[PDB]
Structures are given as C-alpha cells and as structure tokens.
Amino acid sequence: GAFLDKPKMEKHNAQGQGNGLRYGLSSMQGWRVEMEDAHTAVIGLPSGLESWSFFAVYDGHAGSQVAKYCCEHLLDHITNNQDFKGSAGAPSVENVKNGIRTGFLEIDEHMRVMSEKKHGADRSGSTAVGVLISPQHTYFINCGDSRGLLCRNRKVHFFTQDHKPSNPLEKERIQNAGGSVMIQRVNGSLAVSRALGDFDYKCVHGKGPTEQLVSPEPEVHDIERSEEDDQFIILACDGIWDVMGNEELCDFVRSRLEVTDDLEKVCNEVVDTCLYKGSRDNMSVILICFPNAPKVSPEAVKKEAELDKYLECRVEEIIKGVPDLVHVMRTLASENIPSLPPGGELASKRNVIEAVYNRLNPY
C-alpha cells in the first residue's frame, strides 16, 4: 500500500472507426504506484465476425498479470468455444450469452493451469466490463465493480450492476463457501465478489467454479440496438465511478461531445475531471459513439470559449501574499460560477484555470 508523491497524469489513448462506430479511450496511472488497468478495443472480429466489435475495461488487483492476459485473450476464449459457435448459422442470443459465460470460466481455468504449470508467484485478479456489439445487439458483460452504461435518447438506458460482496446473493455464496462478508469485504480483505484470477479464493472443496468465495461468472444483458436512438456507451474502472455517478458522467460526456468530436480528448477530460474530484486510483475510460451521438454545436463551442475566458479573467483578478492554486480554486468555488459543465463542475475546468494561474505565476 503506497501512493506516489505526485500523480502520473500522463495519458495513454487509442481511437478507431468502423461498423458505423467511433471510439476513443484514455487510461492514466494517477496517484497509484502501479498501473493495473488494461483494455480491449477492436472493431471487426476474426473468423467471420467482421461486422462485430468488442470493447472491455479490466481493473487488475494485486498485479496486472491477469488483467493483461484478459485484455489480449478474453475475446477469443469467448468466441472460440462450442457454446458461442453452437448453431450452424449466425449465433443466437443464447449462444452469445452462453459463449461469454464459457469464455469467462475457461480463461479462468486456463490461467489457473498456466500458473500451476509455470510455478507463478503473482496472486493477482481482475474485473472485466465490456460490450460485444453485433449488427443488431449490444451485449453488456460484467464481472466485478468496473461499470458500463448505454446512453440512449439523452438518458441512461442501461447500466451494469457492480458485484459487491455485501450484495444479497454474493454474500450468500461467500457464506456458503465458508467465508464471511466483513463490512464490504470478502473475509475483510477483498472488495470484489467476482473476478478472474484470485485463485486462493477459488479453493473451496465441494463447490463448483461459480460457487467459490470469488466467482468468475459474468452477467450478460442483451439490448436490441436502435439506429435512431442509440447515442454512446461508456466503459470505465471504479477509479472513475467512485467520484462520478451514471447521470452525472452521461450528462458530462454529452456536454463534452457538443464541443469536440475528438473522442480521446473527451476521455482525457473525464479522467482528469475524476483526478480533480479526488480519485486516487488508476483510471480507464472507453467511449463508443453511435451515428446519433451528440454532435458539435456552434453555440456550445462559443459558450465554452466564453467560459474559458471568464475563468482566466477571474484568476487574474484573484491574484490581485500571492494565493496558491489550491486557494484560487477555493475562491472560485465560493463564487458559485454559473454554466459549468454538468457533472464535471469546477473540477472539469481545472486545466483551464491552472494554465492561466501558471501564465501569471510561473515560479
């Protein structure tokens, strides 16, 4: 358990386009000593799933080994089993849902034998959250306390339910496998009830793979796609959700998209806003936009430039000792400034305020 002295605020990004989609992503180490988040983003899938896409965020714990194996290999474990393939034609919803379950259980066991065989020292685990997108369905996948959501028609249409040890059915499984839930933790240690890896928590005799202290079983939800109404999907680790809620972030992302179509930038902005809202964890966001995502608006761009200029003049005037940035931020908050981004608040404007502060007080 250690934090860095100062956060590693450096961004790792990707982006792409195809199958009517556009995506951006951003990942940042932040205040933590290691980076244990991993991701997947592929448009167009092997073996005849050209018109399919896959996006996933993995939040690694006690190492990045499991998360990194998952990020390169969960997809083929899901599509390359007989449950997914199943029926001779195009996979049915059940084939897809079963294929994913099997993919999760098989990669877990696969990693377990690799660890046993090679005498592996790490005792890592990882959450997974993602979407498999077909031409007519969005299949949400969740295992752990990473979270995904769908914005349809300017609202949160669906979000994944985090697997927390104290959730009634999780708690039950844990207690049946000989453990307990202490406050929010499996036996007072583990803050998640579902994950890949964590093999010390999967050693209960007389219980199946999905009946252990920690379960690798995913939750899958089929959502019929809507060309008219579907706007965007957000996937992120708990380093994001710990400080922003579903409605807030969805409102925030909308506001950003009305100013840029640069999706990596929107994602940088989310991650930075979350660092400034007090998040001290690793942060990873993926943003998948559909054709009817919010568009850039001439007024929105202007309003934002007006706000930027306004905050610059406020910083200049506040500086007139010389107040430090913490004190400038404090003064600005107490002003109750109108028209700040929804959900992002003053935190979402810190880079603009600090750039100004740095121009006036560079030493």
* Binding site as annotated, residues for Mn(2+): 59-60, 238, 281
Nearest distance, CB of residue 281 and Mn ion, angstroms: 4
Of 176-184, 187-195, 276-284, 337-345: span binding Mn ion (CB under 5 A): 276-284
Helix (H) or strand (E) holding 252: helix 246-257
Closer of 122 and 324 to Mn ion (Cβ): 122
Closer of 59 and 170 to Mn ion (Cβ): 59
Nearest distance, CB of residue 127 and Mn ion, angstroms: 8
Tell me which DSSP letter residue 201 carries: G
Closer of 25 and 96 to Mn ion (Cβ): 25
Residue 309: C-alpha distances to residues 221, 313, 314, 324, 332 (Å): 45, 6, 9, 20, 14
Q: Is 281 in the site for Mn ion (CB under 5 A)?
A: yes
Task: Fill in the per-residue mask, 182 to 221: x = in contact with Mn ion (CB under 5 A), - = not in contact.
Answer: ----------------------------------------
**C-alpha closest to that of 311 among 360, 359, 342, 354:** 354
**C-alpha closest to that of 232 among 161, 292, 142:** 292
Closer of 91 and 197 to Mn ion (Cβ): 197
Instruction: Please report, as residue ranges, which positions from 22 to 81 form the binding site for Mn ion (by CB under 5 A).
Output: 36, 59-61
Candidate list 162, 238, 272, 345; residue touching Mn ion; CB under 5 A: 238
Q: Is 237 in the site for Mn ion (CB under 5 A)?
A: yes
Distance of CA 289 to the CA centre of its chain: 15
Half-sphere exposure of 352 (CA within 13 A, CB side): 21
Residue 307 near residue 349 (C-beta atoms within 8 A)? yes
Q: Is 239 in the site for Mn ion (CB under 5 A)?
A: yes
Residue 184 near residue 165 (C-beta atoms within 8 A)? yes
Point out which residues bind Mn ion (CB under 5 A): 36, 59-61, 237-239, 281
